[PDB]
Design a protein around this ligand. Sequence first.
Ligand SMILES: CCCSc1c(F)c(F)c(S(N)(=O)=O)c(F)c1F
Ligand SMILES: CCCSc1c(F)c(F)c(S(N)(=O)=O)c(F)c1F
Ligand SMILES: [Zn+2]
Length: 257
Amino acid sequence: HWGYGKHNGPEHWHKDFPIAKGERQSPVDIDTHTAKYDPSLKPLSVSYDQATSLRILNNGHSFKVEFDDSQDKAVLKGGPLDGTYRLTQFHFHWGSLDGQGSEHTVDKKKYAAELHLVHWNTKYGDAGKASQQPDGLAVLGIFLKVGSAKPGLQKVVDVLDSIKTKGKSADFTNFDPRGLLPESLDYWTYPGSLTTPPLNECVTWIVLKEPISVSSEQVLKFRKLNFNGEGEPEELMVDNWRPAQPLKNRQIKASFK
Ligand SMILES: CCCSc1c(F)c(F)c(S(N)(=O)=O)c(F)c1F
Ligand SMILES: CCCSc1c(F)c(F)c(S(N)(=O)=O)c(F)c1F
Ligand SMILES: [Zn+2]
């Protein structure tokens, strides 16, 4: 199985998923000085008022909150996107210590963690079929820095003890993902990929400029999770991030400055 260790981590993924060495892999370093301000980009429209979270689970590579995406309830549009994308899940990537954890970097800076709110293009009817298309998914990426607590994250942090090992899950209703957003929706965008196997090149990335702050106690709880299933050797779930990949011919566009 793929993972993040020395023997099954990012440098090994290309042997099962050759698109790892593709032309539009993610994440990337965002060079804020070469990114092109595009005055034609729209404001992002984040419409999460009717979101319905359902469950939270530890899948062995992160923890994920899944939403009811069977109706048009929590949708992303505007910005660089054509059409309408529906929120299906969010998850995080984070480090073994505060100076690393994010997948995207900004001028080579790593953040403590990165939140991925994952949406699929409604013209493809559902998430799996969307992941097979070059404009199938839109992932809103938000950086986490350690400082003051994010009140809206606490409901997530407080349930993680119940999903410590791979395969555990719990009901998780009435979680409002609006409480995980920073004030500004200024963003960078570029065409890329899933950052884990199968690494499909199906993602329009929209990475917010403004990080959210979370507390040390909040991120500490992420680090208590385990990659392993209950009954296997204990390997804390930390450093579940893919390093920056070559930008190749791509431009990163900015909605601002
Ligand atoms: C302890 C030995 C691990 S076996 C293995 C592996 F090495 C990989 F690199 C992969 S990969 N190419 O998906 O990382 C894999 F799926 C594996 F099962
Ligand atoms: C087939 C799509 C389901 S798999 C998946 C995913 F949904 C992501 F959001 C990501 S991410 N980490 O790019 O947001 C990912 F890497 C995945 F592999
Ligand atoms: Zn992710």
